[PDB]
Specification:
Blueprint: H1 22-31, H2 42-56
Helix pairs in contact: 1-2
Keywords: Disulfide bond, Growth factor, Secreted, Signal
GO cellular component, one term: endoplasmic reticulum
GO biological process, one term: neuron projection development
Length: 65
């Protein structure tokens, strides 16, 4: 045709990563320039995003060991 919509959800507190589809969750990683070659199932993308959320969505830096 000439126009179609796309999703742009990156406010992680708004939507449960468990209830989303793997196609929808892949576009979060594509927006952050990331991939996961070892991901076999949807939950592997979820487990990634859950650690990438405080990396790319917080206003303050993260801290760990």
């Amino acid at each position: 045709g000439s126009h179609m919509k796309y999703e742009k959800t990156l406010d992680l507190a708004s939507v449960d990563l468990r209830k989303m589809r793997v196609a929808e969750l892949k576009q979060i990683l594509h927006s952050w320039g990331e991939e996961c070659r070892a991901c076999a199932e949807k939950t592997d993308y979820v487990n990634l995003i859950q650690e990438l959320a405080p990396k790319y969505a917080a206003t303050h830096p993260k801290t760990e060991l």
